[PDB]
Amino acid sequence: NSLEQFFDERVKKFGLVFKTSLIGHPTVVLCGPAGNRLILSNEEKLVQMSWPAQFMKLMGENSVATRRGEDHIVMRSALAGFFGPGALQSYIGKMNTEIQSHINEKWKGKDEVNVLPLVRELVFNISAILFFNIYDKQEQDRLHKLLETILVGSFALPIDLPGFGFHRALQGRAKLNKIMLSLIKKRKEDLQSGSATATQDLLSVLLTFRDDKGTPLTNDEILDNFSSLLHASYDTTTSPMALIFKLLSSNPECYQKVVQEQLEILSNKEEGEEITWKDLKAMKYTWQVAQETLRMFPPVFGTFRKAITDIQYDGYTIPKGWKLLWTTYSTHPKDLYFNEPEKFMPSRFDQEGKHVAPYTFLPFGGGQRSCVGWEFSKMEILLFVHHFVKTFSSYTPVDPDEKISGDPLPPLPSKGFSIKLFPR
């Protein structure tokens, strides 16, 4: 297909339930909220997660994404020990500290900056500290470059031959796995030496995890999970953080309301008092602007599933071994579900999204395959906007007619969103 070229390629020639051939598999795209409910609500019952083989070889077969059945449930339980709302509140300080440092170091004293490069650095560095407690900038830059190489092979042709992108990506995964295996060895030692806590980061959470039978996670499962996690954490959270101020510039009224919400929160805090989980909950309108950005520019257009049994959706029957694709482009860009879909209206998510119809806004999927790091991303997006507004009274886009594009899946500012900075 050509996502980087066009999106929303529908076929009035067929019903919302239209069959097609995708990645050499008969795939029926179930367009519409009901098709979304069918695919996302019936997991391990009528359908099962199916990733293309190319991705299976890049992130491994021992991740929560590549595992199905009880194992996937166990792997999600271990991850809930870090991404669960209760635990996630224990990492706000480190995340807030990094975002504040990044803004003060690379943004505060700059007349003009390119957002994309800075957002990618902050997003990855936050993962390096929360996943492996790695603060060494050079080590962070090393692993950042290694992930960039492996990410190039995910969209390239799956040719495992010398001098090919997919081949070099597989070489990067082997290197990253060796580095991560070393981190696992050192962490186990630090834990026995009392040099590391069991909740300081995701590595300790995964190592410290035991099944109801008391069986621990294997090193390969920890490596594959960390790889699948690094893939779902970088180019995803980067899309909204780089596009939020681009859309807020085209809708200054919305930016005004965000600044009003942020400065009000600060007016109720002492000097030196750090942002709190309660402060984050007070950023309701800021979160509505983020959801409006995700609706208009979904970092993930949709995912595929495998028919684990014959399916009788509507009148047509989806036989076992068939593929099923759902798309945010069946509801997000539809006036039927979102009035004036081309218009940026954070008001669409007023009252905590109490007016959003079911299976219409699915930026983080739904069911048992829903995003594991959605609130982790929301925390970063809110803390990022907070520190920006706290530091800058205003900002001016260098090219207000800058376009949005993807190479090929992550929608991002076509030129990095260069902006003039006006420090408070």
Ligand code: HEM
């Ligand atoms: C640190 C950041 C993130 C992490 C660690 C993360 C991790 C994950 C994990 C573990 C899953 C479940 C995979 C499975 O078991 O099948 C998932 C699903 C998903 N994530 Fe993320 N994610 C992150 C950020 C994002 C962002 C920013 C978006 C969108 C803007 C996103 C969109 C999704 C979607 C749509 C799904 C479900 C896809 C489907 O099954 O239909 N994620 N993510």
Ligand SMILES: CC1=CCC[C@]2(C)CCC3=C(C)CC[C@H](C[C@@H]12)C3(C)C
């Ligand atoms: C959501 C999800 C969580 C981690 C596992 C997945 C399968 C890795 C492959 C991918 C990413 C690099 C980021 C996002 C989706 C899916 C990923 C696509 C296919 C682009």
